[PDB]
Amino acid sequence: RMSMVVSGLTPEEFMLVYKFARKHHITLTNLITEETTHVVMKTDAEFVCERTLKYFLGIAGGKWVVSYFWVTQSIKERKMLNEHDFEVRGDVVNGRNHQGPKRARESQDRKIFRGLEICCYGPFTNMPTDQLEWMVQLCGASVVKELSSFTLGTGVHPIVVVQPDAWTNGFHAIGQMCEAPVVTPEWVLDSVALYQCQELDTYLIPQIP
Ligand code: NI
């Protein structure tokens, strides 16, 4: 009916959130799933959090993404306060005032990656490939697993995502094996924090033609 996960807390802080749940009758899980309604981030006084995977998947899902002060307040006042009044404004990498989760929460009709074909190519450390894929799918994109498996005809646009630093002979040769733009994960990541497709320009990768 209403389910939660948390990111960046401490055993103590978690203890607190459990209390919250216990009282207000909220479900609590370790893993974030389609069902998870809420994601609670540790933040600074101005509601800036670290960029965590739960952060990202949270936004992708359009779920509620609130600062930890949501909790301590609803405790400090024996009442569940307004999700709205505690949301997350930004994060350490993308700026402290970019108000992402709000959009996504209110942009579920027009998802940024509506009508895309995305292939997360090669090894992904930092993040399980399939979690990334899940992420973009949540944003309307369609996942492809094989470079050779991109659809044809226009209207649809294909994109390749690689984590360059994760390899050990040529990941610049990609433009050869297919006719797609190549970018680093950061494209996606920012596209998701901000909830707005980004200038691949900044993310493109040199293809050995
Ligand atoms: Ni076009």
Coordinates of C-alpha atoms in Angstrom, one line a residue, residues 6-108:
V6 CA 16.6 4.2 2.5
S7 CA 19.9 5.4 1.3
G8 CA 22.9 6.8 3.2
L9 CA 21.8 6.4 6.7
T10 CA 23.3 4.8 9.8
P11 CA 22.1 2.0 12.0
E12 CA 20.7 4.6 14.4
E13 CA 19.1 6.7 11.6
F14 CA 17.6 3.5 10.3
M15 CA 16.3 2.7 13.7
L16 CA 14.5 6.0 13.5
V17 CA 12.9 5.2 10.1
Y18 CA 11.8 1.8 11.4
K19 CA 10.1 3.6 14.2
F20 CA 8.4 5.9 11.7
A21 CA 7.2 2.8 9.7
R22 CA 6.0 0.9 12.8
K23 CA 3.8 3.9 13.8
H24 CA 2.4 5.0 10.5
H25 CA 1.9 1.4 9.3
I26 CA 4.5 1.6 6.5
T27 CA 6.2 -1.3 4.7
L28 CA 9.9 -1.4 4.7
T29 CA 12.3 -3.3 2.4
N30 CA 16.0 -3.6 1.7
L31 CA 15.6 -3.7 -2.1
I32 CA 13.9 -1.2 -4.2
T33 CA 11.3 -2.7 -6.5
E34 CA 8.5 -1.5 -8.8
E35 CA 6.3 -1.4 -5.6
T36 CA 8.5 0.8 -3.5
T37 CA 6.6 4.0 -3.1
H38 CA 9.2 6.0 -1.2
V39 CA 12.9 6.6 -1.0
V40 CA 14.5 8.3 1.9
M41 CA 17.8 10.1 1.4
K42 CA 20.3 11.4 3.9
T43 CA 20.7 15.1 3.0
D44 CA 22.4 18.3 4.2
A45 CA 20.3 21.0 5.7
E46 CA 19.4 22.2 2.2
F47 CA 18.2 18.8 1.0
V48 CA 21.1 17.8 -1.2
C49 CA 22.0 14.1 -1.1
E50 CA 24.7 11.9 -2.5
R51 CA 24.0 10.3 -5.9
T52 CA 23.1 6.7 -5.0
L53 CA 21.6 3.9 -7.1
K54 CA 18.4 4.0 -5.0
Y55 CA 18.4 7.8 -5.7
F56 CA 18.4 7.1 -9.5
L57 CA 16.0 4.1 -9.6
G58 CA 13.8 6.1 -7.3
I59 CA 13.5 9.0 -9.7
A60 CA 13.2 6.7 -12.8
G61 CA 10.2 5.2 -11.1
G62 CA 8.7 8.6 -10.4
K63 CA 8.3 7.4 -6.8
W64 CA 8.4 9.8 -3.8
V65 CA 12.0 10.8 -3.0
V66 CA 12.3 12.6 0.3
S67 CA 15.1 13.8 2.6
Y68 CA 15.7 12.1 5.9
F69 CA 14.4 15.2 7.7
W70 CA 10.9 14.1 6.5
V71 CA 11.3 11.3 9.1
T72 CA 12.8 13.1 12.1
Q73 CA 10.1 15.8 11.8
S74 CA 7.1 13.5 11.5
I75 CA 8.6 12.0 14.7
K76 CA 9.2 15.4 16.3
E77 CA 5.5 16.0 15.7
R78 CA 3.7 12.7 16.2
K79 CA 2.3 13.1 12.7
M80 CA 3.3 12.1 9.1
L81 CA 4.3 15.4 7.5
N82 CA 4.0 16.4 3.9
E83 CA 6.3 14.4 1.5
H84 CA 6.0 17.6 -0.6
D85 CA 7.8 19.8 2.0
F86 CA 10.9 17.6 2.3
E87 CA 11.8 16.5 -1.3
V88 CA 15.3 16.5 -2.6
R89 CA 16.5 19.6 -4.5
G90 CA 19.8 18.3 -5.9
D91 CA 22.9 16.4 -5.2
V92 CA 26.7 16.7 -5.0
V93 CA 27.5 16.1 -8.6
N94 CA 24.7 17.9 -10.5
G95 CA 24.2 20.9 -8.3
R96 CA 22.2 21.8 -5.2
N97 CA 19.2 23.3 -6.9
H98 CA 18.0 21.3 -9.8
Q99 CA 14.8 19.8 -8.4
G100 CA 14.8 16.4 -10.2
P101 CA 12.4 13.9 -8.5
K102 CA 9.6 16.5 -8.6
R103 CA 9.6 16.5 -12.4
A104 CA 9.8 12.7 -12.8
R105 CA 7.0 12.4 -10.3
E106 CA 5.0 14.8 -12.4
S107 CA 6.3 13.7 -15.9
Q108 CA 5.3 10.0 -16.1

